[PDB]
Structures are given as C-alpha cells and as structure tokens.
C-alpha cells in the first residue's frame, strides 16, 4: 500500500472551445485557495514559512510565479479532462449568462499586507442538479488520487503526524480510510468546480 490510480485522461483531448472556461476555472481555484489560507490564519511573506504562516504565492493570479500558474492550470485541466473521460458532456449553452454573475466582496481584513484580496465568484446562489452532486462526489474522490499520485511521485509518503522533513502527510491514504471532514472539504472544492461551469453558461450532464 498504497497505489493511487485515477481516471485515465490520456485519451482525452481538451477541445479548443473549452480552453477559456478552463482558465477561469483555474483562476477561481486560486481565489478560493487564497481565501481558504487567509481563513486559516496564513499571511503573506516573501518566502514560505509554516511557523509564521507566511506563503509566497498569496498574490493576484496575474502575478503568480510562472511555474505555479501552470499547476493551477494543470489542476483545472485535469478536472476538465476527467469530465470528458467519464463521458459527461459540456456545452457552451448561452454566451451571455456569465455577465450577470459577480464576485464575492470579502471584508476588509482579508486584504493582505501586499494588497492582495481574494475575490472568488459568488456561486452560493447556484444549486447544482442532483445528477451533478453524484458527479461531484466521484470527482472529489478522483481528485484525492491525482493529488496522492502526484505527491508520491514527488517522493511523498504517509506520516502519522504531518511533517515536511521528508514528505510525510497523514492524508496520503486510500479514500476509504480518509476522515469525513477531509472528504466533505473535497466535495466542496469540486462542488464549486462544477458551479463555475454552469455559472459561465456552460452545461454538463451525467450518464
């Protein structure tokens, strides 16, 4: 143990009419990432320090280090290709629906020392279809594998207590043995993932 194996997206083209919705999906993952780190107590430093809760990538998406923009794109691309792999169909239904949607305006204290303030899209109003919640769950578990596969290949191993000494993480586990809270947190980050599709006037279905 353990062998994290996710959906095989290697036979999946990303059609060009869906590359722009990937971009806004990745951008909004950052704004949700920045928002969540600030809620935990993290602040902006120039170099990552887990003691002072300081992270370097806590900046506007336009100004992320040029490799880490790709990781957010890679995170977004894979969730998009996994959809097509699972046989879901995504449709650019109405181009106009996106205009009305607006971004969350967080309180003042969320503004960071360098002036960065995360503004994720206000997707609370969107209620997803029941056939999409089951697809959210199947993508929240597959998301746990893409992470567990990539971390292990980066030398990460399980660890009773979390430690960056040598890549030890207690959540590097078969999804069956994860904790409930972590599972719910992943359905959340990917429930938000599907809402970004519908909110942009893009439609997908589960079959």
Curated annotation (Swiss-Prot):
Cellular localisation: Sarcoplasmic reticulum membrane
Subunit structure of this chain's protein: Homotetramer. Heterotetramer with RYR2. Interacts with CALM. Interacts with FKBP1A. Interacts with SELENON.
Clinical disorder: Congenital myopathy 20: An autosomal recessive neuromuscular disorder characterized by variable manifestations. Some patients have congenital limb or distal contractures manifesting soon after birth, while others develop muscle weakness with difficulty running and climbing stairs in early childhood. Additional features may include facial dysmorphism, and delayed development with intellectual disability. Skeletal muscle biopsy may show variation in fiber size with type 1 fiber predominance and atrophy, hypertrophic type 2 fibers, and abundant nemaline bodies.
Family membership noted in the UniProt record: Belongs to the ryanodine receptor (TC 1.A.3.1) family. RYR3 subfamily.
Tissue specificity note: Brain, skeletal muscle, placenta and possibly liver and kidney. In brain, highest levels are found in the cerebellum, hippocampus, caudate nucleus and amygdala, with lower levels in the corpus callosum, substantia nigra and thalamus.
The protein's name in its UniProt record: Ryanodine receptor 3
Free-text comment about domains: The calcium release channel activity resides in the C-terminal region while the remaining part of the protein resides in the cytoplasm.
Ranges for the Sequence repeats: 1-106, 107-207
Organism for this UniProt entry: Homo sapiens
Whole-protein residues included: 848 to 1054 of 4870
Function description: Cytosolic calcium-activated calcium channel that mediates the release of Ca(2+) from the sarcoplasmic reticulum into the cytoplasm in muscle and thereby plays a role in triggering muscle contraction. May regulate Ca(2+) release by other calcium channels. Calcium channel that mediates Ca(2+)-induced Ca(2+) release from the endoplasmic reticulum in non-muscle cells. Contributes to cellular calcium ion homeostasis. Plays a role in cellular calcium signaling.
């Amino acid at each position: 143990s353990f062998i994290p194996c996710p959906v095989d997206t290697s036979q999946v083209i990303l059609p060009p009419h869906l590359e722009k919705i990937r971009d806004r999906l990745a951008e909004n993952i950052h704004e949700l990432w920045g928002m969540n780190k600030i809620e935990l107590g993290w602040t902006f430093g120039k170099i990552r320090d887990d003691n002072k809760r300081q992270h370097p990538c806590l900046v506007e998406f336009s100004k992320l280090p040029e490799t880490e923009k790709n990781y957010n794109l890679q995170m977004s691309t894979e969730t998009l290709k996994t959809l097509l792999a699972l046989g879901c169909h995504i449709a650019h239904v109405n181009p106009a629906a996106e205009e009305d949607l607006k971004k969350v305006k967080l309180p003042k204290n969320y503004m960071m020392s360098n002036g960065y303030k995360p503004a994720p899209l206000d997707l609370s109003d969107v209620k997803l279809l029941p056939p999409q919640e089951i697809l959210v769950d199947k993508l929240a578990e597959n998301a746990h594998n893409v992470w567990a596969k990539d971390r292990i290949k980066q030398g990460w191993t399980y660890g009773i207590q979390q430690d960056l000494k040598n890549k030890r993480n207690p959540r590097l586990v078969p999804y069956a043995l994860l904790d409930e809270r972590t599972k719910k947190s992943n359905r959340d980050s990917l429930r938000e993932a599907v809402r970004t599709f519908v909110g942009y006037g893009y439609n997908i279905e589960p079959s």
